[PDB]
């Protein structure tokens, strides 16, 4: 029964995963999720082997499937999308630059203090041009104003 | 059907090979689920961070060398700037043109010799230098042609001797002299002698030394120009390969029948990174079952 | 929607646009979630023909200790 | 249609007409919606396709609930 | 269950807006709206991340874009 | 379906610019326009391209073509 | 009907008339648009035909969805 | 069940094709597109064959039908197009002639350097003809001024 | 509308106009679309009425597991 119990583990959590990519279906920059199950089987010292059944399934892993997104046009030209491979950087405060999480989603705005945020106000890390060279001489991120 | 290339399928009799450590590829389990991805590392693993065994192709032989598994890596710099050896010219010669003299031939002057091409090379270190090669067409011997070449680098144009050719101008240059039968096609090169040039930085060997800026003195260069045909046809410059490279970073990954994972950089070279090895035992119903 | 680097996905290489193997940045544009209805929906349904497999092997499970027990 | 200044906003920058980062003002003219209606009623297909599919995903989760409540 | 209902409630909502849009189609001076919405994970202090599926979809902010509108 | 909406916004893109083209025809010094548009396909690193289909048309840019006009 | 230069543009060169590159004044006369009424209606068509076309396949996409749906 | 959705796949497939297809119809230089598919079977080692059904139907291609397309008329010499064989070279920046993407489009003008672009700026790669010579000395490309 | 020569396409040949298997260049004119509006919707309707048989297809062996399951 134990093997059944996992089969309808497995399937629920199937169902979760697929319940959840609908959900998220109008989500900016969401990337949809894979959910790979593998087999079970003992590894006792004394196993009959032949005479021994399965142990069910196992949740494996749940992928996050990275394959570009289509992409929808809105003539703002404040919304910012990365073609090909590429994540933007964000910090949660100005002032930490060096905390920050990478995202897709390109809803920028300026903010009070004329920096650029998401729709949760985190600055968005940029780098810092030379006046006449196009080449960025410092690589650190900081926010961008 | 995922459209996702890093995921495989073994259609047919075969088993994938994966190891359980990368230093220890003898310690191996046979699998047939494809879901494949780089690791941090760029090592193509299963799930479990399980390395997938490969073999170890040539660089220009399709077949493998050895049949040893090895964990497959995917490299995302072409990190090995390739100096130029071999460049095969393909050019058809204007039968009708005009002769010139042999002896008065100075790349200077346009009106002394017929034609003139450019390309571009590149050294141990992936500098490009534009090598210039100067073709005359023999007066004193009917289907005959004389060919130079020289090297531009910032310093200027120096002219590059071959180290058999039978050529030699009153200045010193040398060059190598071509010949074709009745039909046009070619009859032979250089008296029949392989085209070796000189080293381009050693002063050793050349009396202008082309200036490396750091790079490999002895660099030599192999003219292949076995398709070199002369027609009715006007000059025409109808086939340039070269085996040099330079840096570039991954672009694509893509995978063909036989099993080798093949990438292209920036660069342009399509680098071979391996191919997938496969397993097949004679009973396929007494494999021990383990997980996953 | 936003990830973070770990163990096993490594470090993050900061990079420009349009340099090396990054690619573009487009202004005027958003992306949208990387999913098919269809592919999802018949997902769904596989998943539920599976859900209803296991009820069923659990149920029988069920039915034969019983059966055992009624002795 | 009216708005005010919040602490996110920031604070009311006051100006004249035509003068630094400030437009220009025309008599005799009115401003209508910024909306454009092929995009809403393409959205609003989009919006209902969404909310099907959702319904769908529910109506699924409690088929399986029910299902197992038949043991 | 509660993802479904989620994504239910992130659909009326982008609807609502849609709505409100195309009701103020005529009213002088209005600025559109746009729903814009985001991905919910838990982050327990023991997740198996590998093993723990999405939490749905969660709106973030109704936007107000302003772009300049047509003069009649 | 957003191939078919890009198709959609395009053809409306086109039809507005048009529309201010045949609105203009009396204006002193104006240029006609002309709307120019591009395909659109993805770069990923993995990339089937055999087996991916294109990926919608994207608006280039709108011209000004400024070829003399008639003198009154 | 004004235009000012931009960085695409390049900057602004001063000159004469019909000197240089530049052409004539000529007094007593204006610039109409140049258009040509015959191309813009034929385009107008011509844009009408492709917006039915790119219709056509995004409701052949939703009743593909909703045929899905309705499984 | 799976040959089923193997076989929605490969019509979704073509449905994506043609609505690129359509919706491209406008671009400039344009190729269209062609879904062909191949038949899939198994190769097992002891396949009874007579007794073993198909496996569906597996996406081959898609192509990339290369026939001329129609011209229409600008009468705006700036714009070029390519009658027969061949396509235009474009190169992303001015200084790298060597990295060029080929293009028939041919909406050219000039930038603020008086070098002949596309509409993103891209130089076009041009040929060095001789000043009483017809024939052209170098076939390097460079870029057009 | 860019391509790029891949190691399938094989190399870049360079040439003139009109010249060996060149083509030649009109100036004045550009390139539409090489499609066919009639064809392109046709394949559109047999593509979906290929997608509702394999839809029915599915539908069937669904509703055979699910008599199966009511055993």
């Excluded at chain 2, 047939?32 to 490969?54: I, P, Q, S, W």
């Excluded at chain 2, 002394?112 to 023999?138: A, E, F, H, V």
């Excluded at chain 3, 993050?12 to 646009?17: A, D, F, L």
């Amino acid at each position: 029964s134990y093997v059944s119990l996992s089969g309808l583990s497995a399937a629920q959590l199937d169902l979760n995963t697929t319940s959840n990519n609908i959900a998220n279906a109008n989500t900016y920059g969401f990337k949809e999720s894979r959910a790979e199950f593998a087999d079970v089987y003992s590894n006792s010292l004394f196993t009959n082997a032949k005479t021994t059944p399965g142990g069910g399934a196992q949740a494996s892993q749940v992928a996050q499937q990275f394959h570009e997104g289509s992409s929808i046009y809105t003539n703002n030209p404040m919304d910012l999308r990365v073609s090909g491979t590429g994540f933007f950087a964000v910090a949660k405060e100005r002032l930490t630059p060096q905390q920050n999480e990478l995202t897709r989603n390109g809803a920028f705005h300026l903010n009070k203090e004329n920096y650029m945020v998401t729709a949760n106000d985190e600055f968005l890390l940029g780098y810092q041009v030379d006046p006449s060279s196009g080449e960025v001489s410092s690589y650190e991120p900081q926010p961008i104003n | 059907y995922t459209n996702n290339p890093m995921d495989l399928r073994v259609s047919g009799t075969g088993f994938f090979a994966v190891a359980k450590e990368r230093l220890t590829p003898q310690q191996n389990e046979l699998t047939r689920n494809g879901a494949f991805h780089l690791n941090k590392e760029n090592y193509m693993v299963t799930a479990n961070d399980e390395f997938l065994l490969g073999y170890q192709v040539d660089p220009s032989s399709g077949e493998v060398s050895s049949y040893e598994p090895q964990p497959i890596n995917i490299p995302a710099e072409f990190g090995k700037p390739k100096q130029t050896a071999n460049i095969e010219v393909g050019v058809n010669l204007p039968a009708n043109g005009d002769l010139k003299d042999p002896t008065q031939f100075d790349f200077s002057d346009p009106d002394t010799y017929n034609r003139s091409t450019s390309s571009t090379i590149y050294d141990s270190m992936g500098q490009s230098y534009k090598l210039t090669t100067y073709y005359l067409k023999d007066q004193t011997q009917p289907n005959t042609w004389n060919t130079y070449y020289t090297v531009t680098d910032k310093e200027g144009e120096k002219p590059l001797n071959v180290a058999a050719g039978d050529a030699q101008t009153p200045t010193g240059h040398v060059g190598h002299t071509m010949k074709f039968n009745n039909d046009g096609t070619l009859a032979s090169l250089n008296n029949g002698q392989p085209i070796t040039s000189v080293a381009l930085g050693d002063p050793a060997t050349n009396t202008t030394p082309v200036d490396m800026n750091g790079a490999d003195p002895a660099q030599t260069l192999n003219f292949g120009l076995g398709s070199a045909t002369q027609f009715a046809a006007p000059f025409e410059l109808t086939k340039f390969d070269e085996d040099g490279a330079t840096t570039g970073f991954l672009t694509k990954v893509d995978f063909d029948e036989n099993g080798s994972v093949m990438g292209t950089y920036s660069n342009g070279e399509n680098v071979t990174l391996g191919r997938v090895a496969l397993v097949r035992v004679p009973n396929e119903q007494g494999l021990d079952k383990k997980g996953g | 929607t936003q990830w973070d680097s770990t163990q096993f996905s490594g470090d993050k290489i900061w990079g420009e646009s349009n340099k090396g193997s990054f690619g573009t940045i487009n202004n005027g544009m958003l992306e949208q979630s990387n999913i098919d209805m269809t592919q999802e929906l018949v997902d769904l349904i596989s998943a539920q023909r599976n859900f209803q497999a296991n009820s069923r092997s659990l149920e029988v499970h069920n039915q034969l200790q019983q059966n055992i027990l009624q002795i």
